[PDB]
Amino acid sequence: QEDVLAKELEDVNKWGLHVFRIAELSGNRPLTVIMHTIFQERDLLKTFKIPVDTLITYLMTLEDHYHADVAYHNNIHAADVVQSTHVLLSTPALEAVFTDLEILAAIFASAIHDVDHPGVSNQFLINTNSELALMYNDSSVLENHHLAVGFKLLQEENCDIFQNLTKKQRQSLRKMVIDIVLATDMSKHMNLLADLKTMVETKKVTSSGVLLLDNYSDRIQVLQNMVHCADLSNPTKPLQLYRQWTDRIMEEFFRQGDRERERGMEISPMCDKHNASVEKSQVGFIDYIVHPLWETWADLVHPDAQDILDTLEDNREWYQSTIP
């Protein structure tokens, strides 16, 4: 079983990694084993003097703080977003663009970006007067919480994976991680995409053919959109993966809708299992959210992401074909 797991982890640089198989083969530790593999692949332990036992201890505690009883926003989703960000960071158009600290920030942000997610939306938490919404003043409620948990866990016994960074490195990393995770709030998507489109329309490329990003605002914007794309990457994956993600998000949505129905609340979009169209909802998700975003990312890194965009378009056609 360990041999099979190691073989599967050889695919860590590939879009379409068998992340559900890795979750089972690793004993429900996909986030730990995928993060560890990526840190080794990128030489991050040596670069940042991260003791291996500290990394494993932190990763296992972080993974434990994802809810094993939530169908979508669990440790498998976190592992998938980590690995997807890892692939996007390796795109030819970004070669030598980001520092080791920025790479570390994007990967760490991906790992923590949904930690302790309860399986219900920000709006549900606001409308039910939850403790989380009271703590965070209705403003990026979940995303503020994910950050606070992900950072607080570094303070547990033998968990400070950043113990050997300089003070300036720790300060810079913390700010970048906050900026990245807060950009995963879906209420920020339209403004984030509008800004990415502006960057594409005005993009500068160096003599080596890579993106020129010469200020913090542009650098963090690219990292924010990269992790947002990874977060919204399910419809761009091979169909057998995509369909499993759809099954999982629908289960989580339907459970939220059942709670809304019981409380006499209006049921959130796509959350009413008695009036659902799973297939039309995927086509709409792609047409209005995922394709606009991925077509723009593909333009930023053209032509690096053409195969990913082609898969997204094929999957849209497939879901559309099930409707009639």
Next chain:
Amino acid sequence: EDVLAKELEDVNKWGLHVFRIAELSGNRPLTVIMHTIFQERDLLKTFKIPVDTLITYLMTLEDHYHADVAYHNNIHAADVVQSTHVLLSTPALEAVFTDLEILAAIFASAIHDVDHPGVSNQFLINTNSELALMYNDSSVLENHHLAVGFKLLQEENCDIFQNLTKKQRQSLRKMVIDIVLATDMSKHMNLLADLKTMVETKKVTVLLLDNYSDRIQVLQNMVHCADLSNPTKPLQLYRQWTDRIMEEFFRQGDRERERGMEISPMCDKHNASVEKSQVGFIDYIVHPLWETWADLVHPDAQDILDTLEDNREWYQSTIP
């Protein structure tokens, strides 16, 4: 009590004897001043607030201001409440704000510094505090003041909004959050820039503010002006506020020094210039803000601006 009632008759006047009221009321200036203002504005009947619920909430809220913090305590909260109350009555703002917007501005003022520990956001961030960890370094104190102020409504017989409709509670909550978050001093320059832009594009008959974006911006700047109103008050009050903020700053500097931290501006008691700092505070923060406010409400802010300019002249004269 008879003296206390006499002092509270000035509740509509800039320059209320708020320290006297704090003394006369047994250190309950926030409770007695809020109660008086809710009566003056008929807010208890308008929003069907039971008087015992109002008093219970106000005393609980006031208890969560720290009595051992020299500036950011219940007296400051009462002063900001009363200052906002006066600014809401500016003639140029006649007919601008609804009763719910008035309630939101007053409630926001009352809670806007609750549970303040007497140290800055930057101190909380640099000391890796629990507050900064909770709030991701962003408007750390202001998010906490809101969370405490709202959480206390859930204590026994404390829900003063129990008889507001569902939509009214939702709208009030949003407005209160928007106002208190705008009291973060790191937002001052953006707030002032937008206030200036409103002045440049202003329409009047008296101000006409059709868009909610514009109205909330005025309420944000209004409570921000009230928060930054000490140098516009009669000098005897202003000097007490200066003594208190300097004591609070110096204690933060003492903690920073004992920890071996870099001492924050104005916080080093061994290298302070209290009077030069007041003149700079007026010249760079308070006068630019209040002059822009005065333009927005031209000419209704003239007496307040006159007091600020007199006080700046006096503090400058104390510098040899």
